[PDB]
Short mmCIF file of C-alpha atoms in Angstrom, two decimals:
data_model
loop_
_atom_site.label_atom_id
_atom_site.label_comp_id
_atom_site.label_asym_id
_atom_site.label_seq_id
_atom_site.Cartn_x
_atom_site.Cartn_y
_atom_site.Cartn_z
CA UNK A 2 -173.01 -28.50 -23.69
CA UNK A 3 -170.81 -29.57 -26.58
CA UNK A 4 -171.63 -32.19 -29.23
CA UNK A 5 -169.43 -33.72 -31.95
CA UNK A 6 -170.52 -36.46 -34.33
CA UNK A 7 -168.43 -39.18 -35.94
CA UNK A 8 -169.11 -41.54 -38.84
CA UNK A 9 -168.52 -43.99 -41.65
CA UNK A 10 -168.69 -41.29 -44.29
CA UNK A 11 -169.34 -44.03 -46.84
CA UNK A 12 -172.04 -46.73 -46.62
CA UNK A 13 -172.90 -49.36 -49.22
CA UNK A 14 -176.50 -49.62 -50.28
CA UNK A 15 -178.37 -52.18 -48.17
CA UNK A 16 -175.79 -51.96 -45.41
CA UNK A 17 -176.18 -50.45 -41.96
CA UNK A 18 -175.26 -46.81 -41.36
CA UNK A 19 -173.67 -46.00 -38.03
CA UNK A 20 -172.97 -42.69 -36.30
CA UNK A 21 -171.86 -41.65 -32.83
CA UNK A 22 -172.06 -38.44 -30.82
CA UNK A 23 -169.83 -37.60 -27.85
CA UNK A 24 -171.14 -35.06 -25.33
CA UNK A 25 -169.16 -32.75 -23.04
CA UNK A 26 -169.91 -30.46 -20.11
CA UNK A 27 -173.20 -32.07 -19.20
CA UNK A 28 -174.01 -35.45 -17.72
CA UNK A 29 -175.80 -37.65 -20.23
CA UNK A 30 -178.10 -39.18 -17.61
CA UNK A 31 -180.42 -36.28 -16.84
CA UNK A 32 -181.52 -35.36 -20.35
CA UNK A 33 -183.36 -36.41 -23.55
CA UNK A 34 -181.27 -36.78 -26.78
CA UNK A 35 -182.19 -36.90 -30.42
CA UNK A 36 -181.02 -37.39 -34.01
CA UNK A 37 -181.97 -35.33 -37.05
CA UNK A 38 -180.70 -35.62 -40.62
CA UNK A 39 -180.62 -33.59 -43.80
CA UNK A 40 -180.43 -35.13 -47.27
CA UNK A 41 -179.45 -33.24 -50.47
CA UNK A 42 -182.37 -31.14 -51.75
CA UNK A 43 -184.54 -32.23 -48.81
CA UNK A 44 -185.35 -30.73 -45.39
CA UNK A 45 -184.41 -31.57 -41.80
CA UNK A 46 -185.93 -34.91 -40.94
CA UNK A 47 -186.59 -35.82 -37.31
CA UNK A 48 -185.35 -39.35 -36.75
CA UNK A 49 -186.36 -40.04 -33.15
CA UNK A 50 -185.19 -39.67 -29.56
CA UNK A 51 -184.09 -41.33 -26.37
CA UNK A 52 -185.46 -40.51 -22.94
CA UNK A 53 -183.66 -40.34 -19.60
CA UNK A 54 -185.32 -43.74 -18.91
CA UNK A 55 -183.45 -45.09 -21.97
CA UNK A 56 -186.72 -45.54 -23.85
CA UNK A 57 -186.78 -44.77 -27.52
CA UNK A 58 -189.43 -43.38 -29.86
CA UNK A 59 -189.11 -42.96 -33.63
CA UNK A 60 -190.61 -41.37 -36.72
CA UNK A 61 -192.76 -43.94 -38.61
CA UNK A 62 -191.27 -42.51 -41.83
CA UNK A 63 -188.03 -44.23 -40.90
CA UNK A 64 -189.94 -47.51 -40.93
CA UNK A 65 -188.27 -49.05 -37.86
CA UNK A 66 -184.98 -49.00 -39.75
CA UNK A 67 -183.63 -46.69 -37.06
CA UNK A 68 -182.21 -47.52 -33.61
CA UNK A 69 -180.88 -45.02 -31.02
CA UNK A 70 -178.86 -45.72 -27.84
CA UNK A 71 -176.90 -44.31 -24.89
CA UNK A 72 -173.56 -45.27 -23.41
CA UNK A 73 -173.12 -43.38 -20.21
CA UNK A 74 -169.80 -45.10 -19.51
CA UNK A 75 -168.44 -43.15 -22.51
CA UNK A 76 -171.05 -40.39 -22.27
CA UNK A 77 -171.82 -41.16 -25.85
CA UNK A 78 -175.04 -41.07 -27.74
CA UNK A 79 -175.33 -43.40 -30.74
CA UNK A 80 -177.44 -44.32 -33.81
CA UNK A 81 -177.64 -47.10 -36.34
CA UNK A 82 -179.79 -47.05 -39.46
CA UNK A 83 -180.15 -50.42 -41.14
CA UNK A 84 -180.80 -51.24 -44.80
CA UNK A 85 -179.62 -47.96 -46.34
CA UNK A 86 -180.24 -46.55 -49.78
CA UNK A 87 -178.94 -43.47 -51.64
CA UNK A 88 -181.73 -41.48 -50.00
CA UNK A 89 -180.10 -42.09 -46.60
CA UNK A 90 -177.09 -40.10 -47.67
CA UNK A 91 -177.29 -37.09 -45.41
CA UNK A 92 -175.56 -34.96 -42.82
CA UNK A 93 -176.51 -36.41 -39.44
CA UNK A 94 -177.01 -34.03 -36.50
CA UNK A 95 -177.27 -34.93 -32.83
CA UNK A 96 -179.10 -32.59 -30.49
CA UNK A 97 -180.55 -32.14 -27.00
CA UNK A 98 -184.31 -32.27 -26.53
CA UNK A 99 -186.34 -30.49 -23.87
CA UNK A 100 -189.92 -31.41 -23.03
CA UNK A 101 -192.47 -28.70 -22.37
CA UNK A 102 -196.17 -28.77 -21.67
CA UNK A 103 -198.90 -26.82 -23.38
CA UNK A 104 -201.90 -26.85 -21.09
CA UNK A 105 -205.15 -25.28 -22.19
CA UNK A 106 -207.55 -26.34 -19.45
CA UNK A 107 -207.81 -29.22 -17.02
CA UNK A 108 -205.02 -31.71 -16.59
CA UNK A 109 -207.36 -34.50 -15.51
CA UNK A 110 -209.56 -33.87 -18.54
CA UNK A 111 -206.33 -34.41 -20.42
CA UNK A 112 -206.51 -30.89 -21.85
CA UNK A 113 -202.78 -30.46 -22.17
CA UNK A 114 -200.09 -31.67 -24.56
CA UNK A 115 -196.30 -32.10 -24.63
CA UNK A 116 -193.82 -30.76 -27.13
CA UNK A 117 -190.08 -31.01 -27.60
CA UNK A 118 -187.54 -28.39 -28.60
CA UNK A 119 -183.95 -29.05 -29.61
CA UNK A 120 -181.85 -26.32 -27.97
CA UNK A 121 -178.28 -27.57 -28.49
CA UNK A 122 -177.03 -29.31 -31.62
CA UNK A 123 -174.00 -30.74 -33.38
CA UNK A 124 -172.34 -29.58 -36.57
CA UNK A 125 -173.41 -32.81 -38.24
CA UNK A 126 -171.44 -35.57 -39.90
CA UNK A 127 -171.45 -36.32 -43.64
CA UNK A 128 -172.59 -39.86 -44.44
CA UNK A 129 -172.82 -41.06 -48.05
CA UNK A 130 -174.42 -44.16 -49.43
CA UNK A 131 -172.46 -45.40 -52.36
CA UNK A 132 -171.05 -48.60 -53.78
CA UNK A 133 -167.66 -47.04 -54.41
CA UNK A 134 -164.68 -47.01 -52.10
CA UNK A 135 -163.19 -44.09 -50.26
CA UNK A 136 -160.53 -42.46 -52.45
CA UNK A 137 -157.79 -40.51 -50.77
CA UNK A 138 -156.76 -37.16 -52.04
CA UNK A 139 -153.38 -36.61 -53.59
CA UNK A 140 -152.45 -33.13 -52.49
CA UNK A 141 -150.28 -30.64 -54.36
CA UNK A 142 -148.55 -27.45 -53.31
CA UNK A 143 -149.50 -24.29 -55.12
CA UNK A 144 -146.47 -22.08 -54.82
CA UNK A 145 -146.16 -18.40 -53.96
CA UNK A 151 -147.09 -7.66 -54.88
CA UNK A 152 -149.59 -5.95 -52.63
CA UNK A 153 -147.06 -6.70 -49.92
CA UNK A 154 -148.60 -10.15 -49.89
CA UNK A 155 -148.23 -13.36 -51.78
CA UNK A 156 -150.83 -16.04 -52.18
CA UNK A 157 -150.17 -19.58 -51.00
CA UNK A 158 -152.24 -22.74 -51.51
CA UNK A 159 -152.71 -26.51 -51.63
CA UNK A 160 -154.54 -28.42 -54.31
CA UNK A 161 -156.46 -31.31 -52.82
CA UNK A 162 -157.18 -33.43 -55.87
CA UNK A 163 -159.63 -36.21 -56.62
CA UNK A 164 -161.08 -37.46 -53.32
CA UNK A 165 -164.33 -39.19 -52.35
CA UNK A 166 -166.60 -38.63 -50.73
CA UNK A 167 -166.97 -35.22 -49.09
CA UNK A 168 -165.88 -33.77 -46.79
CA UNK A 169 -162.20 -32.92 -46.34
CA UNK A 170 -160.67 -31.00 -43.46
CA UNK A 171 -157.97 -28.47 -44.22
CA UNK A 172 -155.76 -26.81 -41.65
CA UNK A 173 -152.64 -24.65 -41.79
CA UNK A 174 -149.96 -24.99 -39.14
CA UNK A 175 -152.90 -25.62 -36.92
CA UNK A 176 -153.59 -22.30 -35.20
CA UNK A 177 -150.92 -19.72 -36.06
CA UNK A 178 -152.13 -19.35 -39.59
CA UNK A 179 -155.71 -18.76 -38.82
CA UNK A 180 -156.08 -15.85 -41.23
CA UNK A 181 -156.12 -14.89 -43.83
CA UNK A 182 -156.79 -18.37 -45.06
CA UNK A 183 -159.66 -19.42 -47.20
CA UNK A 184 -160.59 -22.96 -47.99
CA UNK A 185 -162.89 -22.92 -50.98
CA UNK A 186 -166.00 -25.04 -51.54
CA UNK A 187 -165.09 -28.20 -53.49
CA UNK A 188 -165.73 -28.95 -57.14
CA UNK A 189 -167.53 -32.09 -58.22
CA UNK A 190 -165.83 -33.62 -61.23
CA UNK A 191 -167.60 -35.40 -64.08
CA UNK A 192 -165.53 -38.31 -62.79
CA UNK A 193 -167.47 -37.90 -59.55
CA UNK A 194 -164.25 -37.15 -57.74
CA UNK A 195 -163.97 -34.05 -55.57
CA UNK A 196 -161.23 -31.44 -55.56
CA UNK A 197 -160.94 -28.32 -53.43
CA UNK A 198 -158.25 -25.74 -52.83
CA UNK A 199 -157.09 -23.83 -49.83
CA UNK A 200 -155.04 -20.69 -50.04
CA UNK A 201 -153.60 -18.25 -47.56
CA UNK A 202 -152.13 -14.81 -48.08
CA UNK A 203 -148.70 -14.30 -46.59
CA UNK A 204 -146.04 -11.59 -46.57
CA UNK A 205 -143.38 -11.87 -49.23
CA UNK A 206 -140.81 -10.91 -46.65
CA UNK A 207 -142.02 -13.87 -44.66
CA UNK A 208 -141.73 -16.16 -47.61
CA UNK A 209 -138.34 -17.79 -47.31
CA UNK A 210 -137.97 -17.30 -43.56
CA UNK A 211 -141.31 -18.83 -42.72
CA UNK A 212 -142.94 -22.19 -43.29
CA UNK A 213 -146.52 -23.26 -44.04
CA UNK A 214 -148.13 -26.59 -44.61
CA UNK A 215 -151.63 -27.80 -44.78
CA UNK A 216 -153.15 -30.58 -42.94
CA UNK A 217 -155.54 -32.40 -45.20
CA UNK A 218 -157.80 -34.93 -43.57
CA UNK A 219 -159.96 -37.23 -45.52
CA UNK A 220 -161.54 -39.27 -42.77
CA UNK A 221 -163.64 -41.28 -45.20
CA UNK A 222 -160.50 -42.39 -47.01
CA UNK A 223 -159.33 -42.18 -44.44
CA UNK A 224 -156.15 -40.41 -45.44
CA UNK A 225 -153.80 -37.95 -43.89
CA UNK A 226 -151.11 -35.69 -45.32
CA UNK A 227 -149.13 -32.50 -45.03
CA UNK A 228 -147.56 -30.31 -47.67
CA UNK A 229 -144.72 -27.89 -47.16
CA UNK A 230 -145.42 -25.05 -49.53
CA UNK A 231 -142.33 -23.45 -50.94
CA UNK A 232 -141.50 -21.09 -53.90
CA UNK B 2 -189.35 -28.10 -49.34
CA UNK B 3 -187.66 -24.75 -49.87
CA UNK B 4 -189.83 -21.67 -50.03
CA UNK B 5 -187.86 -18.60 -51.10
CA UNK B 6 -188.38 -15.22 -49.50
CA UNK B 7 -186.35 -12.19 -50.53
CA UNK B 8 -185.95 -9.14 -48.33
CA UNK B 9 -184.30 -5.69 -48.72
CA UNK B 10 -181.42 -5.22 -46.33
CA UNK B 11 -182.39 -3.56 -43.06
CA UNK B 12 -186.14 -4.02 -43.23
CA UNK B 13 -188.50 -6.30 -41.30
CA UNK B 14 -188.85 -9.83 -42.56
CA UNK B 15 -191.89 -11.86 -41.75
CA UNK B 16 -191.94 -15.57 -42.25
CA UNK B 17 -195.32 -17.30 -41.95
CA UNK B 18 -195.62 -20.83 -40.63
CA UNK B 19 -196.32 -23.44 -43.27
CA UNK B 20 -199.01 -25.04 -41.09
CA UNK B 21 -202.08 -23.54 -39.43
CA UNK B 22 -202.76 -25.11 -36.04
CA UNK B 23 -205.97 -27.07 -35.53
CA UNK B 24 -205.72 -26.61 -31.76
CA UNK B 25 -203.94 -24.44 -29.22
CA UNK B 26 -200.23 -24.48 -30.19
CA UNK B 27 -196.57 -24.56 -29.20
CA UNK B 28 -194.40 -23.37 -32.05
CA UNK B 29 -190.66 -23.46 -32.30
CA UNK B 30 -188.53 -21.64 -34.86
CA UNK B 31 -185.18 -22.97 -36.12
CA UNK B 32 -182.47 -21.30 -38.16
CA UNK B 33 -180.17 -23.31 -40.34
CA UNK B 34 -177.18 -21.96 -42.31
CA UNK B 35 -175.56 -24.23 -44.91
CA UNK B 36 -172.68 -26.19 -43.35
CA UNK B 37 -173.46 -25.31 -39.72
CA UNK B 38 -175.48 -26.60 -36.78
CA UNK B 39 -179.11 -25.42 -36.78
CA UNK B 40 -180.11 -23.05 -33.96
CA UNK B 41 -183.22 -22.84 -31.82
CA UNK B 42 -184.50 -19.25 -32.11
CA UNK B 43 -187.97 -19.34 -30.63
CA UNK B 44 -189.58 -21.98 -28.43
CA UNK B 45 -193.08 -22.19 -26.97
CA UNK B 46 -194.47 -19.79 -29.53
CA UNK B 47 -192.72 -16.67 -28.23
CA UNK B 48 -189.75 -17.65 -26.04
CA UNK B 49 -186.26 -16.71 -27.01
CA UNK B 50 -183.22 -18.57 -25.80
CA UNK B 51 -180.49 -16.61 -24.11
CA UNK B 52 -178.05 -15.35 -26.70
CA UNK B 53 -180.62 -15.08 -29.47
CA UNK B 54 -180.87 -11.38 -30.47
CA UNK B 55 -184.21 -9.72 -29.53
CA UNK B 56 -184.43 -9.00 -33.25
CA UNK B 57 -186.31 -12.29 -33.57
CA UNK B 58 -189.91 -12.66 -32.40
CA UNK B 59 -192.82 -15.12 -32.60
CA UNK B 60 -196.55 -14.82 -32.19
CA UNK B 61 -198.07 -15.70 -28.84
CA UNK B 62 -201.03 -18.05 -28.85
CA UNK B 63 -203.72 -15.83 -27.35
CA UNK B 64 -206.48 -17.89 -28.97
CA UNK B 65 -207.02 -15.20 -31.58
CA UNK B 66 -207.14 -16.40 -35.15
CA UNK B 67 -203.50 -15.56 -35.79
CA UNK B 68 -201.01 -17.67 -37.76
CA UNK B 69 -197.57 -18.41 -36.34
CA UNK B 70 -195.09 -15.86 -37.72
CA UNK B 71 -191.38 -15.20 -37.22
CA UNK B 72 -190.45 -11.51 -37.23
CA UNK B 73 -186.88 -10.44 -37.87
CA UNK B 74 -186.46 -6.67 -37.55
CA UNK B 75 -183.39 -4.95 -39.05
CA UNK B 76 -182.56 -8.00 -41.15
CA UNK B 77 -178.80 -8.35 -41.73
CA UNK B 78 -176.82 -10.24 -44.37
CA UNK B 79 -176.10 -12.61 -41.53
CA UNK B 80 -179.78 -13.57 -41.30
CA UNK B 81 -179.64 -15.27 -44.70
CA UNK B 82 -180.44 -18.89 -43.81
CA UNK B 83 -183.24 -21.47 -43.76
CA UNK B 84 -186.05 -21.07 -41.26
CA UNK B 85 -188.18 -24.01 -40.08
CA UNK B 86 -191.40 -23.65 -38.09
CA UNK B 87 -192.01 -26.69 -35.91
CA UNK B 88 -195.69 -26.64 -35.14
CA UNK B 89 -197.23 -28.48 -32.24
CA UNK B 90 -200.99 -28.43 -31.66
CA UNK B 91 -203.70 -30.38 -29.80
CA UNK B 92 -205.61 -32.02 -32.70
CA UNK B 93 -202.69 -32.88 -35.01
CA UNK B 94 -200.78 -35.36 -32.91
CA UNK B 95 -197.10 -35.83 -32.17
CA UNK B 96 -195.52 -33.85 -34.93
CA UNK B 97 -192.52 -35.62 -36.37
CA UNK B 98 -192.25 -33.16 -39.26
CA UNK B 99 -190.14 -30.01 -39.07
CA UNK B 100 -191.88 -28.77 -42.17
CA UNK B 101 -190.35 -27.01 -45.13
CA UNK B 102 -187.72 -24.32 -44.90
CA UNK B 103 -188.28 -20.74 -45.75
CA UNK B 104 -185.02 -19.75 -47.46
CA UNK B 105 -184.28 -16.11 -46.67
CA UNK B 106 -182.26 -14.02 -49.13
CA UNK B 107 -181.12 -10.61 -48.06
CA UNK B 108 -180.67 -8.15 -50.84
CA UNK B 109 -179.06 -4.81 -51.47
CA UNK B 110 -175.65 -5.25 -50.00
CA UNK B 111 -172.83 -3.37 -51.71
CA UNK B 112 -171.29 -4.41 -54.98
CA UNK B 113 -167.93 -6.07 -54.45
CA UNK B 114 -165.27 -6.73 -57.08
CA UNK B 115 -163.76 -10.22 -57.27
CA UNK B 116 -160.22 -11.11 -56.20
CA UNK B 117 -158.57 -13.57 -58.53
CA UNK B 118 -155.65 -15.84 -57.82
CA UNK B 119 -154.27 -18.04 -60.62
CA UNK B 120 -151.95 -21.00 -59.91
CA UNK B 121 -149.96 -22.97 -62.50
CA UNK B 122 -149.52 -26.78 -62.30
CA UNK B 123 -147.28 -27.96 -59.48
CA UNK B 124 -143.94 -29.37 -60.52
CA UNK B 125 -145.22 -32.40 -58.65
CA UNK B 126 -148.41 -32.85 -60.61
CA UNK B 127 -146.33 -32.62 -63.78
CA UNK B 128 -144.15 -35.46 -62.54
CA UNK B 129 -147.35 -37.29 -61.58
CA UNK B 130 -148.23 -36.91 -65.28
CA UNK B 131 -151.10 -34.50 -64.65
CA UNK B 132 -151.60 -30.76 -64.90
CA UNK B 133 -154.41 -28.58 -63.68
CA UNK B 134 -154.62 -24.84 -63.62
CA UNK B 135 -156.42 -23.39 -60.62
CA UNK B 136 -158.33 -20.09 -60.64
CA UNK B 137 -159.76 -18.86 -57.38
CA UNK B 138 -162.35 -16.14 -57.32
CA UNK B 139 -163.53 -14.61 -54.11
CA UNK B 140 -164.92 -11.59 -52.31
CA UNK B 141 -167.49 -10.80 -54.90
CA UNK B 142 -171.05 -9.57 -54.79
CA UNK B 143 -173.52 -10.19 -56.39
CA UNK B 144 -172.94 -13.83 -57.05
CA UNK B 145 -173.22 -14.16 -60.82
CA UNK B 146 -169.87 -14.46 -62.48
CA UNK B 147 -168.46 -15.62 -65.80
CA UNK B 148 -165.21 -17.54 -65.81
CA UNK B 149 -163.46 -18.15 -69.07
CA UNK B 150 -160.18 -19.79 -69.97
CA UNK B 151 -157.82 -18.98 -72.81
CA UNK B 152 -154.85 -20.73 -74.31
CA UNK B 153 -152.71 -18.08 -75.88
CA UNK B 154 -155.22 -16.08 -77.89
CA UNK B 155 -158.02 -18.64 -78.25
CA UNK B 156 -160.67 -19.64 -75.77
CA UNK B 157 -160.37 -23.10 -74.26
CA UNK B 158 -163.80 -24.73 -74.43
CA UNK B 159 -163.05 -27.80 -72.33
CA UNK B 160 -161.17 -29.47 -69.47
CA UNK B 161 -162.80 -26.74 -67.44
CA UNK B 162 -164.81 -27.53 -64.32
CA UNK B 163 -166.05 -24.53 -62.37
CA UNK B 164 -167.98 -24.52 -59.06
CA UNK B 165 -171.23 -22.65 -58.65
CA UNK B 166 -170.65 -19.50 -56.57
CA UNK B 167 -171.61 -19.43 -52.91
CA UNK B 168 -171.40 -17.03 -49.98
CA UNK B 169 -168.42 -17.40 -47.71
CA UNK B 170 -167.96 -16.48 -44.05
CA UNK B 171 -167.55 -12.82 -45.00
CA UNK B 172 -170.94 -12.87 -46.73
CA UNK B 173 -169.39 -12.51 -50.19
CA UNK B 174 -169.19 -15.16 -52.89
CA UNK B 175 -166.39 -17.53 -53.85
CA UNK B 176 -165.87 -19.86 -56.75
CA UNK B 177 -163.10 -21.98 -58.23
CA UNK B 178 -162.35 -22.97 -61.77
CA UNK B 179 -160.10 -25.85 -62.70
CA UNK B 180 -158.48 -26.35 -66.13
CA UNK B 181 -156.76 -29.71 -66.28
CA UNK B 182 -154.18 -30.15 -69.03
CA UNK B 183 -151.65 -32.81 -69.88
CA UNK B 184 -148.00 -31.84 -69.37
CA UNK B 185 -147.33 -31.71 -73.09
CA UNK B 186 -150.29 -29.34 -73.53
CA UNK B 187 -149.10 -27.11 -70.70
CA UNK B 188 -145.68 -26.93 -72.25
CA UNK B 189 -147.36 -26.50 -75.67
CA UNK B 190 -148.63 -22.92 -75.30
CA UNK B 191 -146.67 -19.83 -74.34
CA UNK B 192 -149.46 -18.90 -71.92
CA UNK B 193 -152.90 -19.67 -70.42
CA UNK B 194 -155.33 -17.17 -68.97
CA UNK B 195 -158.24 -17.25 -66.52
CA UNK B 196 -160.62 -14.45 -67.32
CA UNK B 197 -163.36 -13.32 -64.99
CA UNK B 198 -166.22 -11.00 -65.90
CA UNK B 199 -168.35 -9.72 -63.09
CA UNK B 200 -171.08 -7.13 -63.42
CA UNK B 201 -169.82 -6.12 -66.86
CA UNK B 202 -166.18 -5.68 -65.86
CA UNK B 203 -163.65 -8.19 -67.03
CA UNK B 204 -160.28 -8.79 -65.41
CA UNK B 205 -157.85 -11.52 -66.12
CA UNK B 206 -154.76 -13.36 -64.89
CA UNK B 207 -152.05 -15.29 -66.73
CA UNK B 208 -149.38 -18.02 -66.22
CA UNK B 209 -146.72 -19.67 -68.36
CA UNK B 210 -144.49 -22.80 -68.25
CA UNK B 211 -141.27 -21.71 -66.49
#
């Protein structure tokens, strides 16, 4: 099955976080579904799950701040977390959950237990809890010898993480490297994405980078030229 | 939460569960690499999902006094990741906690020299009244690196923000250093340089207002 999350990317303290998860290639009806999160310098926290009967159960450590739902009409799983605080900043993963039974003796004597395993998961979605507003990234071309030249885009001063970067969509798949971002003292983020190209194919060929800052949200393209 | 374990490349790594079961158990093992979806590796103590390499193995609950352990034979640089042991047993209750992560570091991969690309301020940024020099360092191993900046013959001590190195999708490190100048400063010096020293060797690149 395939899962992709979507989000606010920026949530004010004391407001309600909200994330969604679309599912493909499996019917939502016949399974259990769950949410897990990871916060900076912490571990994976199990939020809670929904059953095929649409019943929900949750970690007490969330303190009933969490609520999890299904929308079969859109095949979408969903989650709200009310009253957020900086500690609720996290990447939020949606996953499938299977139930299995460990039985050590007699059923009737209740000598068995259940357990869940998450077998299919999403990539996560970055959600940040901050007062400040999304800031779009101004993006600058870094212009283009080994037989290759280097080509890049500077994606300056955005908030919060993350930022998507693409080149031409598919055709330039490699060799392109988008670097981890730098966190400025300002608290802004900047990253860079370069690709190595043939000099011969400079001046005949064209490259631009698709920069997405969904939290801004902002969108842009740069045509890189010497 | 993180418990480091370091292992020599190609040997057998053995990660113990953080919890010892009170009662007959069902343990799951999860692998999590930074920036990707976690993966179920073992379920029900010893069961491996299709597509998980038989290199991974768990301990069956035979009722012997044996702690849950993940065994990774022939550990590869690709097995560097976090490993959680989700422990279910009969006297502990519904276990909401995934537990802490054992962070696995695989050691003894070959030394790799850094590639270094140095970009001057865009003509755009200059007309946006800003200037930032960009130094990209990749393909190195190990991950400790010194980046230094120079304006002409003297070492710039500030305006410099450099990321902490981290492994990329070719298992080698990458880092970026940014030196932000004002246009009049850029046009002030004949030349700036970004100098990287890795494992004792220093190489350098240079740009100039043109």
